[PDB]
Write an enzyme that holds these catalytic residues in place. Structure first.
Site, PDB file in Angstrom:
ATOM      1  N   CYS A 103      -6.523   2.504   4.612  1.00 53.46           N
ATOM      2  CA  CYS A 103      -7.183   1.346   5.201  1.00 53.46           C
ATOM      3  C   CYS A 103      -6.757   1.218   6.674  1.00 53.46           C
ATOM      4  CB  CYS A 103      -6.821   0.036   4.456  1.00 53.46           C
ATOM      5  SG  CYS A 103      -5.176  -0.638   4.819  1.00 53.46           S
TER       6      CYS A 103
ATOM      7  N   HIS B 297       0.825  -1.218   0.000  1.00 49.17           N
ATOM      8  CA  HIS B 297       0.000   0.000   0.000  1.00 49.17           C
ATOM      9  C   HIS B 297       0.839   1.240   0.000  1.00 49.17           C
ATOM     10  CE1 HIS B 297      -3.998  -2.053   1.442  1.00 49.17           C
ATOM     11  NE2 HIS B 297      -3.525  -2.563   0.289  1.00 49.17           N
TER      12      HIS B 297
ATOM     13  N   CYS C 219      -2.965   0.209   7.496  1.00 50.51           N
ATOM     14  CA  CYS C 219      -2.051   1.313   7.203  1.00 50.51           C
ATOM     15  C   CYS C 219      -2.159   2.454   8.211  1.00 50.51           C
ATOM     16  CB  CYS C 219      -2.277   1.864   5.796  1.00 50.51           C
ATOM     17  SG  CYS C 219      -1.559   0.778   4.555  1.00 50.51           S
TER      18      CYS C 219
ATOM     19  N   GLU D 218       0.615   3.945   1.519  1.00 55.46           N
ATOM     20  CA  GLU D 218       0.843   4.522   2.825  1.00 55.46           C
ATOM     21  C   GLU D 218       2.082   3.871   3.426  1.00 55.46           C
ATOM     22  OE1 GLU D 218      -3.627   4.971   2.068  1.00 55.46           O
ATOM     23  OE2 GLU D 218      -2.237   3.287   1.857  1.00 55.46           O
TER      24      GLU D 218
HETATM   25 ZN    ZN Z   1      -3.516   0.164   3.568  1.00 59.32          ZN
END
Ligand code: ZN
Ligand code: PQR
Ligand code: ZN
Length: 184
Positions: A93, A62, A96, A64
């Site tokens: 999310c 991800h 993260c 992040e």
């Molecule tokens: Zn995430």
């Protein structure tokens, strides 16, 4: 820098559009020098989430997490105060957000500001992570016209063309900031 169509598609804040599977993250750093925030324009950049590896099984990394991966390589001075701004097409999310909360707890020279085009659902459980990130000290907010224009000007290959706001930009932003307040 970013292709105009890529910015426009991804930072669109209309809630009914679909197919924005990616998350784009634009980052900037300021350093506190004697009561003012001074921009460190040499540190500016953007990234997107990684696609899963062709072998399957593991999810793509991800945006992040990539972002956190990179901060240590800026070699910030642990005795100085820094304000790090992320302009994100989706908010984080749950997993993260928790990672981000942990990061800022351990790095107190970093003030984090996440300004998000849209709120990501993460099947309900994402609201919790945004409350966790705020609790650990991050300012979380919804991108308005000002942030969208700044991001266009700063991170897009605009070739001098001014930011052109899409119809509904302001109302969608305002709807989202009411939602976020409820959430926080
Ligand atoms: Zn995430
Ligand atoms: C973060 C980022 C940014 O651009 C402004 O103006 C303010 C913040 N804040 C208030 N962070 O706590
Ligand atoms: Zn792999």
């Amino acid at each position: 820098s970013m292709d105009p169509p890529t910015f426009t598609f991804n930072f669109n804040n209309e809630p009914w559009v679909r197919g924005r599977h990616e998350t784009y993250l634009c980052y900037e750093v300021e350093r506190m020098h004697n009561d003012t925030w001074v921009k460190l324009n040499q540190r500016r950049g953007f990234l997107a989430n990684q696609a899963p590896h062709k072998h399957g099984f593991l999810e793509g990394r991800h945006a992040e997490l990539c972002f956190l991966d990179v901060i240590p390589f800026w070699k910030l001075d642990l005795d100085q105060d820094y304000r790090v701004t992320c302009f994100t097409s989706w908010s984080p999310c749950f997993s993260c957000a928790q990672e981000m909360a942990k990061f800022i707890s351990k790095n107190k020279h970093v003030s984090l500001c996440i300004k998000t085009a849209r709120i990501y659902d993460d099947q309900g459980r994402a609201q919790e992570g945004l409350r966790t990130l705020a609790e650990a000290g991050a300012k979380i907010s919804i991108m308005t016209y000002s942030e969208f224009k700044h991001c266009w000007d700063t991170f897009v290959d605009h070739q001098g063309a001014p930011f052109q706001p899409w119809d509904g930009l302001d109302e969608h932003s305002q709807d989202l900031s009411g939602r976020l307040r409820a959430i926080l």
